[PDB]
């Protein structure tokens, strides 16, 4: 098994040891906070880590379906 990532990778694929069960979407920004709206740092989850004052952290519950909008000429 495994999950997707986004972080310091261009992209990569890992999940955490058997405890986590799904993959998540940490919405925030870069330290550069570039003109692309929201950075999303995908990875391993057991529950959906969402906050309220900034961190949207939604999920996907099945294989590969983790990500957001990205792969478009924009």
């Amino acid at each position: 098994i495994v999950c997707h990532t986004t972080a310091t990778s261009p992209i990569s694929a890992v999940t955490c040891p058997p405890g986590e069960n799904l993959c998540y979407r940490k919405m925030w920004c870069d330290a550069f906070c570039s003109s692309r709206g929201k950075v999303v740092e995908l990875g391993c989850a057991a529950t959906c880590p969402s906050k309220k004052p900034y961190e949207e952290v939604t999920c996907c519950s099945t294989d590969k379906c983790n990500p957001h909008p990205k792969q478009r000429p924009g």
Binding site: D30, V39, K70, G74
Partner: peptide, 14 residues
């Protein structure tokens, strides 16, 4: 170089 919500490539994202 980033995985924002507008691109995935380190050319379009940043």
């Amino acid at each position: 170089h980033r995985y924002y919500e507008s691109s995935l490539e380190p050319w379009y994202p940043d």
